[PDB]
């Protein structure tokens, strides 16, 4: 992944 992509959970 791009390091600046979403690093958080998908609810």
């Amino acid at each position, epitope marked *: 992944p791009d390091p*600046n992509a*979403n*690093p958080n*959970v998908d609810p």
Partner: antibody
Amino acid sequence: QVQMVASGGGVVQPGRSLRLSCAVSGFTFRNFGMHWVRQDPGRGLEWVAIIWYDGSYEFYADSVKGRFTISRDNSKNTLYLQMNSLRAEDTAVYYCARSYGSLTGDETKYGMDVWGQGTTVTVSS
Amino acid sequence: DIQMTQSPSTLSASVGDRVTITCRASQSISSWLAWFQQKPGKAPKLLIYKASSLESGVPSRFSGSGSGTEFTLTISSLQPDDFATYYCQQYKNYWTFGQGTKVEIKR
């Protein structure tokens, strides 16, 4: 109230090791990516490492690649930075920072929002 | 590495003045620019995200504008709690910061 505190800093000689930890409060730790950021004596800020929410991906700055490891214990809600082969240039205050707390997915690039209190690391012969 | 540059490095101002700080980027970062505030001895605080969006509870005396390579933080009326060092940060390719702009008290 989203709040964080880094600890574990100290004074080591070049080439030795040090482990930093970060405690959190007021948010669900296992749901957000975490950063380590440091601030050099010249008040300059530089990013160190990022870890995904589930620990599936870790990215490091070129200065610390191979010597530093970022990790997390999503059950104890703790962020870790293990350092070995420390250099004098690593002398800084190390902060932990949460990635921007959006759980929507609308954006394509993500930064940081909440920074914890820093811990001081001094590397000198 | 996308290089960030701020101007000025030090800014003398008085309470109630309109203060403007500029941030320049070596490459077009679209609107992925953030403004942080850091008071001495404390950790930075996020004030403005996505170039122009104020965070919750940030006073509306703060404003941000710009896109591409030139960005601007404007404080419409400097209050005593606004004397600090302000950093900009791009979050397009990794995360890099400006050197900081110190807002001091003019006497």
